[PDB]
């Protein structure tokens, strides 16, 4: 049989591969670079614009645009280059051969799915397509049918409660703290130690300091006092040129804004109170099963200690007879793709695809009809 593609556009990373594989063939940043200087040599083989691992490699010469921000596609002429690169160069497969499965954050604009569909049928000419809510796939991946899922990538965060495969749409919370806003905060705070980062090609440096050095405090105000009093906490990192920077009590302040969005001036509650408020919107027969199955998902949940901090600060809110368990598997950065990999391989699913014969009759609005 022709196996279907699974392509988790996410934001910031593209994860793609064939259904039934256990990890993606292709993981590269969803980034489009255009050169900004004047090219001076002649015969160089200059190229208009670079996608993904090229734009990461050459980044000092380029301006880097992310075409997706907060799970909304904001530039279609960029985005279509990224898909084109995914099918033809990175997987090296013509998408006209076999179906494609795509993933989206819940509750985002209705027109985004219509454009995805229109591009998949019109240009790539895919035989069939589907779009799937990311947080549903994280349950298929973690092997559960009852869960509440804190799914938090670059771009977007959301909670979806699912009980025995019935989703509870009235209780879906979405929040716009994400890896990109921890990164932009980490830029504005490193300036206190004098380091400065003003360009996209070095926003991509701060994004990697954040990945290696940062961690989340089990209780904030005592580590804030400790590392203000003892320098023992600070660690150092080599910039690309060989300059050494040093980061101290700062390196836990940026991931901790997930729990206090007040630090960047958002009103809304952190991920713990939105998780709990999402459980409270569910009806009381199921709350005990949601409290047991809290599933972390997506990359922004990778910070060391985010599991134990969640279990602490939800146990501070839940009734003390309940039992609270945070399930944070080590793969979790990929669990949305792994979940889409099993979903697309189920024989029961083969009916579910939006086939081209349906789309040509009903038009792109068919998604709202036949998808979730």
């Amino acid at each position: 049989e022709t196996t279907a593609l699974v392509c988790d556009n996410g934001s910031g990373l593209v994860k793609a591969g064939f259904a039934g594989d256990d990890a993606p063939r292709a993981v590269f940043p969803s980034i489009v670079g255009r050169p900004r200087h004047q090219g001076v040599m002649v015969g160089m083989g200059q190229k208009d614009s670079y996608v993904g691992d090229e734009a990461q490699s050459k980044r000092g010469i380029l301006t880097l645009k992310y075409p997706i921000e907060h799970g909304i596609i904001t530039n279609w002429d960029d985005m279509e280059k990224i898909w084109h690169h995914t099918f033809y160069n990175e997987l090296r497969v013509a998408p006209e051969e076999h179906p494609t499965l795509l993933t989206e954050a819940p509750l985002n604009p209705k027109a985004n799915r219509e454009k995805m569909t229109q591009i998949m049928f019109e240009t790539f000419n895919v035989p069939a397509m589907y779009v799937a809510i990311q947080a549903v796939l994280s349950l298929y991946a973690s092997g559960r049918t009852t869960g509440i899922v804190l799914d938090s990538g670059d771009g977007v965060t959301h909670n979806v409660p699912i009980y025995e495969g019935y989703a509870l749409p009235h209780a879906i919370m979405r929040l716009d703290l994400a890896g990109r806003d921890l990164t932009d905060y980490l830029m504005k705070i490193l300036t206190e130690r004098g380091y400065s980062f003003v360009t996209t090609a070095e926003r991509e440096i701060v994004r990697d300091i954040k990945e290696k050095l940062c961690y989340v405090a089990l209780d904030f105000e005592n580590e804030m006092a400790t590392a203000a009093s003892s320098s023992s906490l600070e660690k150092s990192y080599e910039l690309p040129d060989g300059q050494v920077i040093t980061i101290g009590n700062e390196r836990f302040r940026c991931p901790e804004t997930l729990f206090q969005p007040s630090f960047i001036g958002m009103e809304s509650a952190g991920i713990h109170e939105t998780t709990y408020n999402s459980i409270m919107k569910c009806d009381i027969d199921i709350r005990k099963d949601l409290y047991a199955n809290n599933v972390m998902s997506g990359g922004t949940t990778m910070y060391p200690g985010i599991a134990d901090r969640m279990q602490k600060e939800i146990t501070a809110l839940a009734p003390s007879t309940m039992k609270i368990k945070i399930i944070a598997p080590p793969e979790r950065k990929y669990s949305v793709w792994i979940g889409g990999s099993i979903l697309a391989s189920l024989s029961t699913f083969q009916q579910m695809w939006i086939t081209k014969q349906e789309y040509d009759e009903a038009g792109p609005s068919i998604v709202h009809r036949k998808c979730f």
Partner: peptide
């Protein structure tokens, strides 16, 4: 987005 935010 289209209103309440930049996207």
């Amino acid at each position: 987005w289209x209103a309440x935010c930049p996207a």
